[PDB]
């Protein structure tokens, strides 16, 4: 009978949409999950949606997910109060079943769920204070104290005095009464929190505005006899701007930095001003470029910019990354512009950084010497780099650092004779060449 | 104006002994709004 077929296969599809939507609910997916859920026929499946949300909450695989499930139920209760009403009936009845069973786990689950539904104004604080009064007439205090941790902020706002009275009763037991040691300590801790104020207990998924929740605050009491329409969980047979071409904005900041730089005697007070500005991580790349561009105007290198960059490095690793990235940017992209003079500035300026290890040294690996790929201007750059880097180390420490720095592409031992001829011939063209002996051996080994 | 800068203030009692370095800066010269001004020693290359 193809209407009974259609309506059954539609009911089945609705159930198997709702189940995986509930199973894929999280904070930061909740609003896409709620869209999808709203595109299912929630009203026809009202009991199917209630039973999946309860059974997921209650599966105790969750419990952590109770705040998420409560936020989903809050959204849905603004849309369709009849659904949130149904879900709150069954959850009350599940709490009272688990209390009477003495199932402490399902007490803890369902009580935490009622707590967060009250946090989201789905249900009235009356139900919480009645649950807590019932609990506190027996011990059950592990239950009562978890509940009060998870509602107790909202209870203090809405109903200070009743809550206060309960605390007085709760307080009364601890000071003048005998209790099991494990139970008491948890009981005391809640007492500690009251002085603390619950400041690890007011954080979550408030993803409806206090007027966009159409605030159907359902006034249940946990001693009604209620309905819970399990039967709606059967199958049945329903016969029913401007583009920016100008950096002038960045030009302002450029003049502010350059002006900070031209003031400030010594170097060590200029680092103070620059670090004082607290530059956002985005810009701390370019500020370096301003520094060096300025250093190229000075017509001669100065220890100033060296000690400046050194005092700037050691403060924060973002400046490490800054100078490294700018080293690659300079050597790779930007060298082709500079005349042989400004190269005399750059060579020493990076020499002081490398020889004292601030750079660090292995970042020299970018350099590769080939007739095919090199810049003669860049060649001069290397010349000044090592000719500065020697004078501080003295060609002694140089060989040790290099030999321990595993520079490969620059110092080929693997083969390619002609390249080794270019390397050795090059360092002998610098006027040093004493780094090339190990390669000279490989010449005779190749021949 | 060569006097704005900032002046290293470090540790009167110790700087008689170690040369502690520059641990602090006393304000060199003042203003209503700060702005900044360049100072000569920056515009003349060092002897070295």
């Amino acid at each position: 009978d193809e209407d009974i077929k259609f309506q059954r296969e539609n009911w089945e599809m609705i159930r198997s949409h709702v189940s995986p939507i509930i199973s894929n609910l999280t904070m930061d997916n909740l609003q896409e999950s709620h869209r999808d859920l709203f595109q299912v026929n929630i009203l026809i499946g009202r009991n199917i949606i209630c039973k999946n949300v309860v059974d997921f909450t209650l599966n105790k695989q969750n419990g952590r997910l109770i705040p998420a499930l409560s936020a989903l139920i809050a959204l849905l209760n603004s849309d369709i109060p009849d659904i949130g009403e149904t879900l709150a009936k069954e959850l009350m009845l599940m709490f009272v079943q688990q209390f009477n069973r003495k199932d402490y786990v399902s007490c803890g689950n369902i009580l935490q769920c009622l707590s967060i539904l009250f946090l989201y104004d789905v249900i009235h604080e009356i139900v919480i204070l009645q649950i807590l009064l019932l609990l506190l007439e027996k011990n059950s205090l592990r239950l009562v104290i978890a509940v009060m941790k998870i509602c107790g902020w909202k209870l203090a706002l809405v109903s200070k005095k009743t809550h206060d009275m309960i605390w007085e009763k709760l307080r009364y037991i601890l000071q003048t009464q005998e209790l099991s040691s494990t139970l008491r300590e948890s009981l005391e801790t809640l007492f500690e929190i009251r002085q603390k104020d619950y400041k690890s207990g007011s954080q979550g998924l408030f993803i409806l505005d206090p007027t966009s929740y159409t605030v159907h605050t359902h006034s249940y009491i946990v001693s009604d006899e209620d309905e819970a329409n399990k039967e709606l969980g059967n199958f049945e047979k329903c016969e029913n701007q401007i583009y920016d071409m100008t950096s002038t904005n960045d030009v302002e900041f450029k003049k502010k930095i350059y002006l900070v730089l031209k003031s400030s005697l010594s170097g060590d007070e200029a680092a103070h001003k620059l670090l004082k500005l607290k530059i956002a991580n985005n810009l701390k790349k370019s500020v370096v470029d301003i520094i060096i561009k300025s250093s190229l105007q000075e017509s001669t290198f100065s220890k100033f910019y060296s000690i400046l960059s050194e005092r700037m490095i050691t403060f924060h690793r973002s400046w490490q990354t800054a100078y490294n990235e700018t080293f690659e940017q300079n050597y790779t992209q930007d060298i082709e512009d500079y005349e042989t003079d400004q190269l005399r500035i750059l060579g020493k300026f990076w020499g002081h950084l490398i020889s004292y290890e601030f750079l660090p040294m292995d970042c020299l690996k970018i350099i590769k010497l080939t007739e095919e790929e090199s810049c003669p201007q860049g060649r001069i750059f290397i010349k000044f780099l090592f000719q500065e880097l020697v004078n501080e180390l003295g060609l002694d420490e140089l060989q040790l650092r290099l030999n321990s720095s595993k520079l490969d592409g620059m110092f080929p031992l693997e083969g390619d004779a002609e390249h080794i001829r270019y390397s050795i011939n090059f360092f002998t063209a610098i006027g040093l060449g004493l780094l090339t002996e190990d390669m000279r051996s490989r010449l005779t080994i190749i021949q | 104006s060569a006097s704005h800068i900032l002046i290293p203030a470090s540790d009167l009692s110790w700087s008689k002994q170690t040369d502690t370095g520059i641990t602090h800066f006393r304000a060199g010269m003042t203003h209503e709004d700060e702005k900044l001004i360049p100072t000569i020693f920056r515009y003349i290359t060092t002897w070295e």
Binding site: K276, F315 | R26, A27
Partner: peptide, 27 residues
């Protein structure tokens, strides 16, 4: 706090006697 840095007082020094820690050299 005045730790022994600064001036005995700022009167004849013409400055503001404003002292501030140096972010530059620490580690």
């Amino acid at each position: 706090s005045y730790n022994g840095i600064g001036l005995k007082s700022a009167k004849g020094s013409s400055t503001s006697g404003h002292v501030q820690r140096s972010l530059a050299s620490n580690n």
